[PDB]
Each structure stands twice: as structure tokens, then as C-alpha cells.
Design a protein around this ligand. Structure first.
Ligand SMILES: CCCCCCCCCCC1=C(C)C(=O)C(OC)=C(OC)C1=O
Ligand code: SF4
Ligand code: SF4
Lengths: 198, 146
């Protein structure tokens, strides 16, 4: 099940075209260059994931471009203040296809605890989001988990190989939700460690 | 009425004489307590009568006499805990005249306070166990008050 942008459609996928699409998706998901964009405390946890104790470079996602033209991923790591929202939209518009968006933290997801006069209630009011991370802040490994989720989503999307031949529509996979996937193993939990120890 | 000792036996049976001794003349029908009778058990019996003869109108008598009864029951069985005699003294202070709706509860707490004043060694002998009001709840560290 796919979503078309140019509609809920089916899988359009010759066997050589499928292999070429798989190779392009493999190269795109294994080389994701985030945009160095600091909004709030969630950015501190993101760059913590970039350091030696977590080493997000292992996934090939460390290059951290200061220019939106060279970046493939925008991580909205912080509150979308109303004065910063046109800046965020302009930086997203300066990015080139293919581009992906991760909302990091409750502020970027929905506004979080800041249902206040000067805060946009979630970045998906004005730019489209591919992966959402709950947390305030999400820990660095939560950001790495979202990076792996984005890699899974990239690995079976369909985009044109060339702009001169073939379908130019972008097909994004309608994934099963992580909540329904993990419901079986989460409800079966019975006992946890008591909070009086280390 | 308040208990009196053998030193007060040389006192005339008048309202003013027994009033200045820390007791009341009352009905002037005196009752004698010998050495065999435990003072804690006697006061427990008295307070059991007074608590079960409360009319139930007002809070200090109705809800504080059963507390004193339960404290004296615990002191009788040696299950007294620290703060029980302090609770009895606080009940004596706060069930006096003007604090309850009628004079039944001041008369209830007169023998308790007189026996605490004169025979405190018998009430202190009932306190054996350490004070415990809570049980441990697994996963929650208690606030260890010092
Ligand atoms: C694809 C070829 C890459 C060659 C090396 C690129 C530059 C060094 C690594 C990227 C990087 C940059 C630019 C950088 O500025 C930085 O500091 C914020 C890092 O640490 C988190 C980086 O990892
Ligand atoms: S979600 Fe929490 S940690 Fe992240 S930017 Fe908002 S206030 Fe900071
Ligand atoms: S002190 Fe008198 S009015 Fe109050 S509950 Fe006791 S018997 Fe009733």
C-alpha cells in the first residue's frame, strides 16, 4: 500500500527497474546528511547522538551540512517559535529532492508543553513530516531509532530514477504503525524493576 | 470525678474543699480502689463506659473517647506505643469544659487525667512496641523522618 504525490495506490513495481530502484534506495538510506539546525534543547540531544559515546557516524549519518542544498534530512529538533517558523519553511524550501523530515521532541511534534501565544503547535502545521519522535527531550538513541525508522521508510519508497524517462510521481510506503507492531510485546510485560535501586 | 490519693483523705467533703484539691465533690458517694486493681484497666473500664454512653452529638466526645478507649486497651495488653500517653493528655486538654457540647466528656476525661497525674508509672509500663502506623510498600522508599 502506497501514497502517491505528483492518492492511495498500489505497488507500481521489469525486474531490472526494481533492482535499480533498490540500489538507489540503498544508497539514499545509507547516506543521509542532516542539516545542522539548532532550535532548542532537542538539538543538544541530537548532537549528543553525534558524539563518541553514541557515534551516529556508524550509520553514515554524521556529515551534518551547514547548507540546505547539501542536506538530505531536516531534523526539527526544538520548538517552532512563530518568529522561527518562516525561517524553518525557507530552509526546508531551499532543500533539494529527495528530502526527509524528522520531528524531534514534543515541541516539534505538537507544540508540547508550550501551548502558548508565541509557539506554532507542531511543525507539521506547515511542513510535512516523515518520522515523529516523542520525548522532551528524546534521548540520543531515540533519535537513532528514528533514523533507522526513516531508513526503513526510504528503503521501500519509489522515486523516478531520471527526470526525463518514466513516472515522475513519488510513492511513499504506508507503513504499519510502530504502536500496533509493538503492541504484542508491550502488553505482555508483567513485572518491572522497582524504582528504589540503581 | 478525678481520682484522689491517700493524702487527700484528710479533707472535708465540701464542694469548695474537693474543688481546690483538683477534683469534684460530685454525688459525695466515694469509691475506694485498693492496690490489687490495675489503674490502667480501671481507667479503661471507665472510658469504655463513657465512650459507649456518648450521645453522639459532638465530635470530641464521640470520636475521641473511642480513641482513648483503644489506647487504653492497647496499654492493657502491653501493645502501647510512644505518643499514646501524649495522645491521652491531648484528649484531656481538648475534651475539657467549653470544648464539647455538654459536660459528659469533661467528666469522662477527669479520671483519666487524674490517674495519669498520680499513677503515670502504670501507664508507662504499657508502652512496649515501637510506634508503627504504616506498612512498607514495595517500590516506594519511605520518608524517614528523624
Ligand atoms: C562524505 C565525506 C565526508 C568527509 C568528512 C566531512 C567533514 C567531517 C565530518 C562531518 C562533521 C562536521 C562537518 C562537523 O562540523 C561536526 O561538528 C559539528 C561534526 O561532528 C558532529 C561532523 O561529524
Ligand atoms: S520537546 Fe522539550 S527538550 Fe525538546 S525542545 Fe521542547 S522543551 Fe526542549
Ligand atoms: S459531650 Fe455530651 S453532647 Fe457531646 S457527644 Fe458527648 S454526651 Fe453528646
Amino acid at each position: 500500500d502506497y501514497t502517491l504525490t505528483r492518492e492511495i495506490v498500489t505497488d507500481p513495481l521489469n525486474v531490472f527497474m526494481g533492482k535499480l530502484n533498490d540500489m538507489v534506495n540503498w544508497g539514499r538510506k545509507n547516506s543521509i546528511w542532516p542539516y545542522n539546525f539548532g532550535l532548542s534543547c532537542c538539538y543538544v540531544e541530537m548532537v549528543t547522538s553525534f558524539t563518541a559515546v553514541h557515534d551516529v557516524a556508524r550509520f553514515g549519518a554524521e556529515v551534518l551540512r551547514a547548507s540546505p542544498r547539501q542536506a538530505d534530512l531536516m531534523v526539527v529538533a526544538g520548538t517552532c517559535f512563530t518568529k522561527m517558523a518562516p525561517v524553518i519553511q525557507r530552509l526546508y524550501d531551499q532543500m533539494l529532492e529527495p528530502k526527509w523530515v524528522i520531528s524531534m521532541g514534543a515541541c516539534a511534534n505538537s507544540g508540547g508543553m508550550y501551548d502558548i501565544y508565541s509557539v506554532v503547535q507542531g511543525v507539521d502545521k506547515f511542513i510535512p513530516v516523515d518520522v515523529y519522535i516523542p520525548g522532551c527531550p528524546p534521548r540520543p538513541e531515540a533519535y537513532m531509532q528514528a533514523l533507522m525508522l526513516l531508513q526503513e521508510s526510504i528503503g521501500k519508497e519509489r522515486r523516478p530514477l531520471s527526470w526525463v524517462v518514466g513516472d515522475q510521481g513519488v510513492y511513499r510506503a504506508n507503513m504499519q504503525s510502530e504502536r500496533e507492531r509493538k503492541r504484542g510485546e508491550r502488553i505482555a510485560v508483567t513485572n518491572l524493576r522497582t524504582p528504589d535501586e540503581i | 470525678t478525678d481520682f484522689l490519693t491517700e493524702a487527700h483523705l484528710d479533707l472535708p467533703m465540701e464542694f469548695e474543699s474537693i474543688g481546690k484539691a483538683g477534683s469534684r465533690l460530685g454525688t459525695a458517694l466515694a469509691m475506694a480502689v485498693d492496690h490489687e486493681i490495675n489503674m490502667v484497666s480501671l481507667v479503661r473500664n471507665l472510658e469504655e463506659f463513657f465512650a459507649r454512653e456518648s450521645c453522639g452529638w459532638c465530635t470530641p466526645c464521640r470520636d475521641g473517647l473511642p480513641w482513648s478507649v483503644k489506647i487504653l486497651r492497647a496499654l492493657e495488653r502491653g501493645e502501647g506505643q510512644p505518643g499514646d500517653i501524649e495522645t491521652l493528655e491531648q484528649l484531656c486538654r481538648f475534651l475539657g469544659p467549653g470544648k464539647t457540647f455538654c459536660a459528659h466528656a469533661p467528666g469522662a476525661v477527669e479520671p483519666l487525667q487524674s490517674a495519669i497525674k498520680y499513677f503515670r508509672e502504670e501507664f508507662e509500663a504499657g508502652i512496649k512496641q515501637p510506634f508503627s502506623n504504616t506498612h512498607l510498600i514495595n517500590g516506594i522508599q519511605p520518608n524517614l523522618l528523624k
